[PDB]
Short mmCIF file of C-alpha atoms in Angstrom, two decimals:
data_model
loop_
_atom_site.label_atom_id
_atom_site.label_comp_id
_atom_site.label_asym_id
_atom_site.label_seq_id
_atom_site.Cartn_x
_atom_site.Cartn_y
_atom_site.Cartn_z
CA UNK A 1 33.97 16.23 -0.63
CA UNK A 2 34.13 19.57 -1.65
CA UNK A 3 37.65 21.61 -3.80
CA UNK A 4 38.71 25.13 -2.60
CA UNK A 5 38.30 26.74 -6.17
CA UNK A 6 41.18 26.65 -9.44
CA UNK A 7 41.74 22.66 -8.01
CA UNK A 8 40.46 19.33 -9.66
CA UNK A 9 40.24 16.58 -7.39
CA UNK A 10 41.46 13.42 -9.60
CA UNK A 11 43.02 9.60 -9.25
CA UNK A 12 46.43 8.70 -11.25
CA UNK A 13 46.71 5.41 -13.09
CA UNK A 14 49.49 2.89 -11.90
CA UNK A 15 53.22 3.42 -12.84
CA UNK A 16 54.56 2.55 -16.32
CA UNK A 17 52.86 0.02 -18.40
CA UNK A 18 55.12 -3.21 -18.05
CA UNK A 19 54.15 -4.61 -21.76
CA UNK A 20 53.99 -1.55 -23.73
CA UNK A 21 55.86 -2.85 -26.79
CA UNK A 22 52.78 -5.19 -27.72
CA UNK A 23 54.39 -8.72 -26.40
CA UNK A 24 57.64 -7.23 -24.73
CA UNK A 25 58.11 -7.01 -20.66
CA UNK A 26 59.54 -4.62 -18.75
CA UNK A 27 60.26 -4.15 -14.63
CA UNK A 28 60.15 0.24 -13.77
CA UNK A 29 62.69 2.50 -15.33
CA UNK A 30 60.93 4.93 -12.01
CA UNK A 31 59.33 7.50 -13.53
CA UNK A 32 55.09 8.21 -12.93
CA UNK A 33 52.39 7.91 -14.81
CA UNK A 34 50.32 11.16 -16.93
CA UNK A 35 46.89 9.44 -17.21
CA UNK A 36 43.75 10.69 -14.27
CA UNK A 37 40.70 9.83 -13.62
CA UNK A 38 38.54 12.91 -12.72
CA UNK A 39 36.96 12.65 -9.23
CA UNK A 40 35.47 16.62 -8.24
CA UNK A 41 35.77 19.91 -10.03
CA UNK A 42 36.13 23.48 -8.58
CA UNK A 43 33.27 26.05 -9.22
CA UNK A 44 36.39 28.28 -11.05
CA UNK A 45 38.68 30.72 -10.75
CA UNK A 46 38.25 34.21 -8.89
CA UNK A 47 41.24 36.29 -10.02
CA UNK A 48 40.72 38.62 -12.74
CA UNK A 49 37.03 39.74 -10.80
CA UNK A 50 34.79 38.77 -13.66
CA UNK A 51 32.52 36.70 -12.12
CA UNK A 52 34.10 32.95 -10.56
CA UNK A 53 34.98 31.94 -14.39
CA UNK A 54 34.60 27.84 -14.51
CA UNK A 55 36.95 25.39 -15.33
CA UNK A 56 36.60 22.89 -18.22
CA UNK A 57 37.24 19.33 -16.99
CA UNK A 58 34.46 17.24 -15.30
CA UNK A 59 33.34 14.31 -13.35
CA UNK A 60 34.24 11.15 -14.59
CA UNK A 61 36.71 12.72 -17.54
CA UNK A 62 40.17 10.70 -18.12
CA UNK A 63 42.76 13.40 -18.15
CA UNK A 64 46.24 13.72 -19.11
CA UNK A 65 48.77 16.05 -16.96
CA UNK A 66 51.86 17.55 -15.79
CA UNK A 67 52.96 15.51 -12.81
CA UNK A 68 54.33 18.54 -11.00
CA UNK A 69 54.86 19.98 -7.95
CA UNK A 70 51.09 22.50 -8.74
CA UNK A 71 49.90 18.51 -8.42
CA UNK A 72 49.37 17.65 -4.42
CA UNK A 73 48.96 13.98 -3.37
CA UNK A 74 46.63 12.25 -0.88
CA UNK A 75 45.30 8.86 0.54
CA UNK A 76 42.22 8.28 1.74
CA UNK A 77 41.00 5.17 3.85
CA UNK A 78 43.68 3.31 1.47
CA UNK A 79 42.08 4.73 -1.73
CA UNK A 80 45.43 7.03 -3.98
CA UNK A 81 43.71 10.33 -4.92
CA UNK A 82 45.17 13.97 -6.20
CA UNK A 83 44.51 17.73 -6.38
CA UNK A 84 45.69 19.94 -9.09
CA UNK A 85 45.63 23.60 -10.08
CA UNK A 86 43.57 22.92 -13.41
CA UNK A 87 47.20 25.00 -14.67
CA UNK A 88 48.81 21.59 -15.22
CA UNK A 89 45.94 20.11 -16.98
CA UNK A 90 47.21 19.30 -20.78
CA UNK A 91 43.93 17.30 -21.61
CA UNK A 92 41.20 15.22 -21.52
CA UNK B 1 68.18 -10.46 10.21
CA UNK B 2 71.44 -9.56 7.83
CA UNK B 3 72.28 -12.04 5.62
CA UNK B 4 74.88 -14.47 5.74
CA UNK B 5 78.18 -14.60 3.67
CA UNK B 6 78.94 -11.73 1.06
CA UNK B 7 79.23 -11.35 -2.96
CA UNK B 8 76.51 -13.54 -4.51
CA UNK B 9 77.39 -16.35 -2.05
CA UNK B 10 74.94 -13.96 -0.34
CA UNK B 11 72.24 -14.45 -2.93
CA UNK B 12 72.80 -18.45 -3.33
CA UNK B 13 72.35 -18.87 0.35
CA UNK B 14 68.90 -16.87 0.24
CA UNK B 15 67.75 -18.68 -2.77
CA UNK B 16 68.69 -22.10 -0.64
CA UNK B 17 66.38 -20.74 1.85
CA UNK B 18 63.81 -19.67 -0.46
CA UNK B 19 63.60 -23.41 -1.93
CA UNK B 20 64.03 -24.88 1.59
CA UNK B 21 60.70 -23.00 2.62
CA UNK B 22 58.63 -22.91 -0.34
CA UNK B 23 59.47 -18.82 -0.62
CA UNK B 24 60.49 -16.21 -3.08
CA UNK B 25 63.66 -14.45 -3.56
CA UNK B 26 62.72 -10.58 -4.24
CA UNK B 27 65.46 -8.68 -5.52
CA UNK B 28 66.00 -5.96 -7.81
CA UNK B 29 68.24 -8.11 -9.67
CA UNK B 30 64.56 -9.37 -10.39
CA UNK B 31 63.20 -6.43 -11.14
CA UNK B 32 60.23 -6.04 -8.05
CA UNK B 33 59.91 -3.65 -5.69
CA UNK B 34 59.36 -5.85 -2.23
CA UNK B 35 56.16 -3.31 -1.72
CA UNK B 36 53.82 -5.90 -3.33
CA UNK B 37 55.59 -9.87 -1.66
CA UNK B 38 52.38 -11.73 -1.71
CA UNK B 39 50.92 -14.88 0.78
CA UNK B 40 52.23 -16.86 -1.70
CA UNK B 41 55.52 -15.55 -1.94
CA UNK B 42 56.19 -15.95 1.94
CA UNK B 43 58.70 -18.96 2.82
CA UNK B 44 57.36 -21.35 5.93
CA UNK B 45 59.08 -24.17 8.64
CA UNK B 46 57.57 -26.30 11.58
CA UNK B 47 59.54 -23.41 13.31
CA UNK B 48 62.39 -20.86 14.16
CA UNK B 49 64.88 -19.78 16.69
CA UNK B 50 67.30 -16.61 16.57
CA UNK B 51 70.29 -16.09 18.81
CA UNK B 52 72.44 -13.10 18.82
CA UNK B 53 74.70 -14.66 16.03
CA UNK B 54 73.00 -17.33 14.29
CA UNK B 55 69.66 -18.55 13.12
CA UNK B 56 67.77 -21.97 12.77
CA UNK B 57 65.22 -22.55 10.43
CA UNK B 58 63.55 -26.18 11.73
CA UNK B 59 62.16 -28.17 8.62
CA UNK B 60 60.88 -27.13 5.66
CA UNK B 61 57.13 -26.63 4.95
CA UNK B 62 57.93 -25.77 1.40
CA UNK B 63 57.34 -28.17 -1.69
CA UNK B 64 59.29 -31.64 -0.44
CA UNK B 65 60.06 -32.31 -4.26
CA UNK B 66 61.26 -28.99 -4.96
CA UNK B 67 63.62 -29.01 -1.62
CA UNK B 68 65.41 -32.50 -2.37
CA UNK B 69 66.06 -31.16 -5.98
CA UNK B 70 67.61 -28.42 -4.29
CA UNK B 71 69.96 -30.46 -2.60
CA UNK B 72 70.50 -32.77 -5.23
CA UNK B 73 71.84 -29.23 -7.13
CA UNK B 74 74.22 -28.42 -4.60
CA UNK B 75 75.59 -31.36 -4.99
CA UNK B 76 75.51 -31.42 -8.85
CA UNK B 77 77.43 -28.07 -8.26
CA UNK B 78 80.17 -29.86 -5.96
CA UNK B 79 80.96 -31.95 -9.16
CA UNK B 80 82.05 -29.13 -11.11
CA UNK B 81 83.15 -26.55 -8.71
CA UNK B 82 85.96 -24.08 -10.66
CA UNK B 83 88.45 -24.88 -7.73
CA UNK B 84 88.43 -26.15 -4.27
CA UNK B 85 87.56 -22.87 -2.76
CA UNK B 86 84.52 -23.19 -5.05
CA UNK B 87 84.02 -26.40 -3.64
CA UNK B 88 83.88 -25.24 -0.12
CA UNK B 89 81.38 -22.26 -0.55
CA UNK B 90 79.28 -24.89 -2.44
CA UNK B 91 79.85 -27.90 0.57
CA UNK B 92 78.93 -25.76 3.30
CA UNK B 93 75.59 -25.58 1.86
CA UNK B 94 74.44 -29.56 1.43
CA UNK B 95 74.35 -30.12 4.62
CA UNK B 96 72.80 -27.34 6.23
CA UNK B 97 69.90 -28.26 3.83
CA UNK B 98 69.84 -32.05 4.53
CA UNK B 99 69.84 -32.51 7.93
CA UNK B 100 71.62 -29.36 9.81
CA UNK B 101 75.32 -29.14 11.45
CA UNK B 102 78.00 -30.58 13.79
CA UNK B 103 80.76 -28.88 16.17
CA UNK B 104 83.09 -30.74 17.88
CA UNK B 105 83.91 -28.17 21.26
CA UNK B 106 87.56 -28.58 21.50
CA UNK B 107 89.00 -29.42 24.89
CA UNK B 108 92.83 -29.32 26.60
CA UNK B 109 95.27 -28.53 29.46
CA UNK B 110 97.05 -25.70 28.01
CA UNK B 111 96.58 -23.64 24.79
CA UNK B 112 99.75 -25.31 22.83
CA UNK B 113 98.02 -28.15 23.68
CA UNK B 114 94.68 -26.89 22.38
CA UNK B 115 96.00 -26.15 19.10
CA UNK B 116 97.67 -29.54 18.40
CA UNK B 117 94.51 -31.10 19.55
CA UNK B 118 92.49 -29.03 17.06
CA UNK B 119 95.23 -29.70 14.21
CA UNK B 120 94.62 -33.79 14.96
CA UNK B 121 90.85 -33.18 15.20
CA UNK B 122 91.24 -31.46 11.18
CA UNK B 123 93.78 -34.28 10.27
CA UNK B 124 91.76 -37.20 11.31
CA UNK B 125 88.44 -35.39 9.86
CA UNK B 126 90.74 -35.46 6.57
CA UNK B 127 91.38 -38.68 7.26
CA UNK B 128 88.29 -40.69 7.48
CA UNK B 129 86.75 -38.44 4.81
CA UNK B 130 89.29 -39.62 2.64
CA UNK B 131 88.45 -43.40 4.06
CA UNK B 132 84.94 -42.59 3.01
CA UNK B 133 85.77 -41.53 -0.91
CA UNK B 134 88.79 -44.38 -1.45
CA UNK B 135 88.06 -46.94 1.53
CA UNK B 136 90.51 -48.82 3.63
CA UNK B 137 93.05 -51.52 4.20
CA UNK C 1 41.11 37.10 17.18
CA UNK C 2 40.54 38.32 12.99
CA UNK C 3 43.59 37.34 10.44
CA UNK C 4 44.47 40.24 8.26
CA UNK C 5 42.88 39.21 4.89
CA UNK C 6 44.13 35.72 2.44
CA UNK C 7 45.21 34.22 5.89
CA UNK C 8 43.24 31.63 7.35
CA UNK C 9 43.75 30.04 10.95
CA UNK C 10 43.64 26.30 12.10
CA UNK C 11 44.96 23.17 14.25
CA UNK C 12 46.72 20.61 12.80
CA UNK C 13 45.14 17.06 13.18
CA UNK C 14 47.56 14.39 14.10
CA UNK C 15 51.32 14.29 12.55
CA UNK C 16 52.30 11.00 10.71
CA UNK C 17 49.06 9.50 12.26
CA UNK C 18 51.14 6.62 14.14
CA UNK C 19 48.01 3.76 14.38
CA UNK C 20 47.13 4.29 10.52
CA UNK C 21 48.22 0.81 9.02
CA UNK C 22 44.89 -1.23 10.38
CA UNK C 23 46.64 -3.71 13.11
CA UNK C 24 50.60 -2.53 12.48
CA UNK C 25 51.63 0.80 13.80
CA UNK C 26 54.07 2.96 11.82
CA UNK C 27 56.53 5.25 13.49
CA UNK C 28 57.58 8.22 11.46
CA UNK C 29 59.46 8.81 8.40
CA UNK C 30 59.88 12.47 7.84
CA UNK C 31 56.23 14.10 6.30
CA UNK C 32 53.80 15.85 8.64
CA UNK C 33 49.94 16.22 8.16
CA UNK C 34 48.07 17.53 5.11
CA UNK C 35 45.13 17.46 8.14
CA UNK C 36 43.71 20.58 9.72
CA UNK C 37 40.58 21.99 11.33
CA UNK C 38 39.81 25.99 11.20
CA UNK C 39 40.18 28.42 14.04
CA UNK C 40 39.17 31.55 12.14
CA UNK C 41 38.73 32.82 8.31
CA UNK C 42 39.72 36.59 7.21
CA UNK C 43 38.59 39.68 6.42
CA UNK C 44 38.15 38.27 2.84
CA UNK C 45 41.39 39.50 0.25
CA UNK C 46 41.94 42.97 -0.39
CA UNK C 47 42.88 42.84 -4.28
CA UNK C 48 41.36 43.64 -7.81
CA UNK C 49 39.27 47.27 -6.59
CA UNK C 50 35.88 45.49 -6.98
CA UNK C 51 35.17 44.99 -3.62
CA UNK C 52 37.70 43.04 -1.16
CA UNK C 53 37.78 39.52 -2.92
CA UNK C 54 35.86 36.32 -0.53
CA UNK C 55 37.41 33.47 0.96
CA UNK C 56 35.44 29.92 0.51
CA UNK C 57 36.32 28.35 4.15
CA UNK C 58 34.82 28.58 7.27
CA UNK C 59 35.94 28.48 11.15
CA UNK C 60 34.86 24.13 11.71
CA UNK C 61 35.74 22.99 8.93
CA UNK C 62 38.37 20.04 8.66
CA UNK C 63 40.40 21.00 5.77
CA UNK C 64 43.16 19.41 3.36
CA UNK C 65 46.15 21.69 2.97
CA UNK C 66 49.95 21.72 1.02
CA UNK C 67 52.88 21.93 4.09
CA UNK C 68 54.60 24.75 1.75
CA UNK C 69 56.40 28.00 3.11
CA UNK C 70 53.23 29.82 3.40
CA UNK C 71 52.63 27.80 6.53
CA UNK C 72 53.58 29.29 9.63
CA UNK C 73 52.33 28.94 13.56
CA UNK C 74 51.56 30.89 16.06
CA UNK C 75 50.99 30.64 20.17
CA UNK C 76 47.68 30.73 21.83
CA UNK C 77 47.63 30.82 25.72
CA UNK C 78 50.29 27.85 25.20
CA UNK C 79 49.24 25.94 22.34
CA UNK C 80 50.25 25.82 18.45
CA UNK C 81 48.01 27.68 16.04
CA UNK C 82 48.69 27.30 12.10
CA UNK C 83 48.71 30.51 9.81
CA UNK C 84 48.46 29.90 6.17
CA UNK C 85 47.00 31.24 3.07
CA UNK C 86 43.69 29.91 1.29
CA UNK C 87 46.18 29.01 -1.49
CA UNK C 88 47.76 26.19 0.55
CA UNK C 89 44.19 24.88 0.66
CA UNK C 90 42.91 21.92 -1.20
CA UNK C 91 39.59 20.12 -0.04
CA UNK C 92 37.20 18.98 2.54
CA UNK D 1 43.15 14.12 -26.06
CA UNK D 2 41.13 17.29 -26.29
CA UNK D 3 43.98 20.52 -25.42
CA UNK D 4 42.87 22.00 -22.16
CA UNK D 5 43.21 25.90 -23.48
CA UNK D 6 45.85 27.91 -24.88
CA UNK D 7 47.38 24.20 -25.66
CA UNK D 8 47.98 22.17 -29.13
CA UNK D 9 48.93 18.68 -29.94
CA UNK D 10 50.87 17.84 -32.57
CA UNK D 11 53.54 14.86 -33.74
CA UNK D 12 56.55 16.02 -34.47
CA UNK D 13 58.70 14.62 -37.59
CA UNK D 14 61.74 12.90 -37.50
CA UNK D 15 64.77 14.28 -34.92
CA UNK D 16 67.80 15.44 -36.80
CA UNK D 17 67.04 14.23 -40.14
CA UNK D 18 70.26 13.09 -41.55
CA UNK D 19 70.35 14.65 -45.03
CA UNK D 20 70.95 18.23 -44.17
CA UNK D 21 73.57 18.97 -46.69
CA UNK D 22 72.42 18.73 -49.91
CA UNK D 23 73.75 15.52 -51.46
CA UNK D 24 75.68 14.94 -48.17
CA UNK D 25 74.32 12.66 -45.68
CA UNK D 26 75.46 14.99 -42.71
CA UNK D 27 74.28 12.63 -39.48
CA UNK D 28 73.44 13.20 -35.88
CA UNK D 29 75.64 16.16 -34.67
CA UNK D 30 73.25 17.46 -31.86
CA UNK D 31 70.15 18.98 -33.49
CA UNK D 32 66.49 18.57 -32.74
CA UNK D 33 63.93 18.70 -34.53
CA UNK D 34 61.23 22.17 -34.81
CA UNK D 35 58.30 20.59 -37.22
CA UNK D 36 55.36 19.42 -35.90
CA UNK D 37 51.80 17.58 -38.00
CA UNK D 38 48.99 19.20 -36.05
CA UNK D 39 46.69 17.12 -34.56
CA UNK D 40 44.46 19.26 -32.37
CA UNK D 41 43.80 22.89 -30.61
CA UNK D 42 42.54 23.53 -27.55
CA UNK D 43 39.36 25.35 -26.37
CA UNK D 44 40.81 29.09 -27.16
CA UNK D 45 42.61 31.25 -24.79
CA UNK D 46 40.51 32.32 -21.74
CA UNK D 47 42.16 34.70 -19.35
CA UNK D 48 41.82 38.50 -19.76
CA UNK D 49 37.85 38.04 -18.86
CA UNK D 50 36.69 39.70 -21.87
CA UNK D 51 35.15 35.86 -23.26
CA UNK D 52 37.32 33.87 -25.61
CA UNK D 53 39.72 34.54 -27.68
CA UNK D 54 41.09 32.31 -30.68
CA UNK D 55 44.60 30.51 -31.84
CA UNK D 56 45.78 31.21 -35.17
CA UNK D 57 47.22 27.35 -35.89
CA UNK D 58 44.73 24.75 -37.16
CA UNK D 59 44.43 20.98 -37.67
CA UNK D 60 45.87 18.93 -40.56
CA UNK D 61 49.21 22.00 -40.74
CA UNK D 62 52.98 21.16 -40.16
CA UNK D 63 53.86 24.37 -37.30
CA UNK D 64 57.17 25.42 -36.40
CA UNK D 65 57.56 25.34 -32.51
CA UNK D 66 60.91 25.71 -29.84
CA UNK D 67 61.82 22.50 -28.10
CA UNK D 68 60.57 24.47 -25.00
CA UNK D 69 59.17 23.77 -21.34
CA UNK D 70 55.55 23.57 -22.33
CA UNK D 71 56.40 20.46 -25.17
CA UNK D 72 55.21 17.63 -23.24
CA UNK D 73 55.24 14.22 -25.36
CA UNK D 74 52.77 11.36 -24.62
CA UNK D 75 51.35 7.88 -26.72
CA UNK D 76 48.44 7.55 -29.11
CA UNK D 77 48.19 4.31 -31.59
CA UNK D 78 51.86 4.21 -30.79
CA UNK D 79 52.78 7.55 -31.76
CA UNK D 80 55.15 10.16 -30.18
CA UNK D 81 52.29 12.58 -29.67
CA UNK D 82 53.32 16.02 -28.58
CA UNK D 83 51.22 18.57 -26.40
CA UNK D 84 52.68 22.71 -25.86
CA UNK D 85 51.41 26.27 -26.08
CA UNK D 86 50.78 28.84 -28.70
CA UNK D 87 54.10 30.45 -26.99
CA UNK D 88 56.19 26.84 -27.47
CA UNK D 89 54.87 27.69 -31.35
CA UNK D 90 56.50 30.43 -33.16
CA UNK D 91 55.64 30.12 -37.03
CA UNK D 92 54.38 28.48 -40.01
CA UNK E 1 57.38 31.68 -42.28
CA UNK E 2 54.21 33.29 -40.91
CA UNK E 3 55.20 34.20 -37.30
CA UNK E 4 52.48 33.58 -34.80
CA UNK E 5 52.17 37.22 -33.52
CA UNK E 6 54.16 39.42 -31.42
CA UNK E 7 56.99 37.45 -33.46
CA UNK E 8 58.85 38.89 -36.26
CA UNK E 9 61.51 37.08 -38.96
CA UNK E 10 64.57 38.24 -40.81
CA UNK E 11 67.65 37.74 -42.22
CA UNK E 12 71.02 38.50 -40.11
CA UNK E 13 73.58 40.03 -42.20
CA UNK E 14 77.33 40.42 -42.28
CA UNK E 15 79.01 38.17 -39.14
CA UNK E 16 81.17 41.10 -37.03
CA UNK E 17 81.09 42.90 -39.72
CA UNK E 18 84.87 43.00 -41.00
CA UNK E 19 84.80 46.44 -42.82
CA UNK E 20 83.03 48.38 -39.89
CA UNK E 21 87.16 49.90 -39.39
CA UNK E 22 87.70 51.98 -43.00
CA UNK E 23 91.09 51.48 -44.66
CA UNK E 24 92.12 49.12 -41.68
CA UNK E 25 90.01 45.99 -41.16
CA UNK E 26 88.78 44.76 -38.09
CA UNK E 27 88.90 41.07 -37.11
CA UNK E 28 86.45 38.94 -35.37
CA UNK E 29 86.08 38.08 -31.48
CA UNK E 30 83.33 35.93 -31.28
CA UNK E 31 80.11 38.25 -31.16
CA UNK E 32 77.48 38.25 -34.08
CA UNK E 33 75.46 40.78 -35.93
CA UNK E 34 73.12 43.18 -34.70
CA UNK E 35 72.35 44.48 -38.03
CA UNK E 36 69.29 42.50 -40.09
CA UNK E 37 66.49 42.69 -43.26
CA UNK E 38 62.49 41.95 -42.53
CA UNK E 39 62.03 38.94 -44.59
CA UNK E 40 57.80 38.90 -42.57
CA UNK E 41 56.05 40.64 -39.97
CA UNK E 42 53.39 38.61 -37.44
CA UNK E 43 49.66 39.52 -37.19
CA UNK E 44 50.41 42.31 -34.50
CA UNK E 45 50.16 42.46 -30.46
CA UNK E 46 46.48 40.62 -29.11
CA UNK E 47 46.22 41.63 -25.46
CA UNK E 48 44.06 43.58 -23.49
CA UNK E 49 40.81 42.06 -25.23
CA UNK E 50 40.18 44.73 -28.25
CA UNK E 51 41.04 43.29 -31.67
CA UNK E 52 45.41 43.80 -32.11
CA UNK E 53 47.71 46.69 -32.06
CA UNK E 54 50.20 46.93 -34.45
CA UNK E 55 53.86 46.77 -34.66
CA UNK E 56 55.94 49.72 -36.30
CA UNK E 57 58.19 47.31 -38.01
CA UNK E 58 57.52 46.54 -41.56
CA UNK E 59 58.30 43.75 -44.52
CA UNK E 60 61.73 44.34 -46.27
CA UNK E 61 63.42 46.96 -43.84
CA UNK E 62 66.72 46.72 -43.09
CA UNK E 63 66.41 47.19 -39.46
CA UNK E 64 68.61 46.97 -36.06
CA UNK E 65 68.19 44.21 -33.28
CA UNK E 66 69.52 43.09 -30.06
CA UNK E 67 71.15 39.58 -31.04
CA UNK E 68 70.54 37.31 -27.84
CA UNK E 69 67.97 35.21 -26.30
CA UNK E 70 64.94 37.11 -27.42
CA UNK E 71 65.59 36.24 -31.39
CA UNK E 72 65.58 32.64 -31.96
CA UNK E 73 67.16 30.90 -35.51
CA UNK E 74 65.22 28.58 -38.05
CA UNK E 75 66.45 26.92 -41.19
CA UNK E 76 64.24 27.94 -44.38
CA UNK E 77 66.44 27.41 -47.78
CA UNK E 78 69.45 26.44 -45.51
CA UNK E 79 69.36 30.13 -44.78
CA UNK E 80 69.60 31.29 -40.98
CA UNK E 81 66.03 32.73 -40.67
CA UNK E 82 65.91 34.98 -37.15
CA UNK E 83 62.61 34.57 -35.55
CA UNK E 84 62.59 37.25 -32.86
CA UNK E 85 59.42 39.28 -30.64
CA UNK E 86 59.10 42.87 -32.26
CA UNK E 87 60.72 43.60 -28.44
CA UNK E 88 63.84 42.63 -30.34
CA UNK E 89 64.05 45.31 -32.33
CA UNK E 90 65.85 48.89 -31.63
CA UNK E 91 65.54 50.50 -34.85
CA UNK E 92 66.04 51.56 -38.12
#
């Protein structure tokens, strides 16, 4: 695989943890869920002409981000993945 | 298939099922999504038949213990019913559990006749159920 | 044919790929294709002075793409062409 | 949680603190809260090409930010912790 | 009440100011006050790479602002502290 430069390729965790409170349960209240893990980086960003300037996530990096519409959503042979603009990255 | 009746008679007749067939009920009442119903969760009979208006469900392959204690509820239910219209929408259900239904296809020469046939049909139902509770003389 | 720099060309691959559920076949529920495969690539991206900017696909590639208003079509000799921008584009 | 540039982390202190007054224990009334314990800064600000340039905020400092649309909260040891610009910041 | 650059902070003065009339007073309609007093002045303007240029405001003036969006409010001594951009500012 191969990202068309500003994107990270990444994989979201599963939706809401259902015993958060320690012992407590809980069902969905339907929201999504912030934590990644990193999959394939882009080799930067172009705009601004100064060279491609790189990003600063990596392979294998467990990220935290804004689960927004600059985040696009795939499956592949069953397998959830995502591609963001590194824009909506808040951390590792 | 829609389900039968409506209110939570609706969900008491799906949980009847459930038992009947060794299933699971999924509901959000339950709080799961039915994305995720397992090959556990999946209710089974020696067979089925549909029809346009009903449908038979022809014995149980669930848990035999599990299925008489669901009758045996029913009936614990009949015992304390809130009324007698709770008593029907609990009655209906014993039965159709423990062995399946009966009709009696009403036959006459006219259609006054038809109904006081019917009405003696209910009356001597009443009757000999009443027999069966008190006995006779 | 040449698109007139930041556009990029392509076919769509199938739309809500209909035999994709291993022995069950799904019918359609109201998405598209993220899908396509390149036609032909610009004259690169005429912005920022130093030099015309480059674009990063190339005409056979199979591509990943976001179905935003950027995409538009096109009619070759009967068929459907797609006309986007490289920003729609994702991955390969 | 290392801030992916321009961003800081901080936990913020307790929404509408009800002692406001003085003596008076004025209650909830519909405030927020603007103080947040800084808990990290990201890896400088990196647009404008010319390398990178620094935040003025450090770690271990109580900041006054907006309640604006780059606070994003998030969980560490049970914590509300809080992620947002230099812009969501405005003073200490 | 250091404000993060760009930023300035003051104190508002006199609510629609009832003695702007002469021998007649004026009343109040709901607006604000436009006139203020530097109580600090941020570390200057950052971009386009070379160190800061300044601001032409300065501590303890008694200087004229546009009172909306811009300016934001802050509670320091149970004062109302204005912490606006330097873009605020009309004059003195």
């Amino acid at each position: 695989i191969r990202p068309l430069h500003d994107r990270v390729i990444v994989k979201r965790k599963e939706v809401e943890t259902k015993s958060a409170g320690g012992i407590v349960l809980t069902g969905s209240a339907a929201a999504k869920s912030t934590r990644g893990e990193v999959l394939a980086v882009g080799n930067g960003r172009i705009l601004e002409n100064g060279e491609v300037k790189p990003l600063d996530v990596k392979v294998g990096d467990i990220v935290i981000f804004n689960d927004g519409y600059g985040v696009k959503s795939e499956k592949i042979d069953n397998e959830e993945v995502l591609i963001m603009s590194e824009s909506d990255i808040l951390a590792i | 298939v829609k389900a039968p009746g409506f209110g939570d008679r609706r969900k008491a007749m799906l949980q009847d099922i459930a038992t009947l067939t060794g299933g699971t009920v999924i509901s959000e009442e339950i709080g799961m999504e039915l994305e995720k119903a397992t090959l556990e969760d999946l209710g089974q009979a020696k067979r089925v038949v549909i029809n346009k208006d009903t449908t038979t469900i022809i014995d149980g392959v669930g848990e035999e213990a599990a299925i008489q204690g669901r009758v045996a509820q029913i009936r614990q239910q009949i015992e304390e019913a809130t009324s007698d219209y709770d008593r029907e929408k609990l009655q209906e259900r014993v039965a159709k559990l423990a062995g399946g239904v009966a009709v009696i296809k009403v036959g006459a020469a006219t259609e006054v006749e038809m109904k006081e046939k019917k009405a003696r049909v209910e009356d001597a139902l009443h009757a000999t159920r009443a027999a069966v509770e008190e006995g006779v003389v």
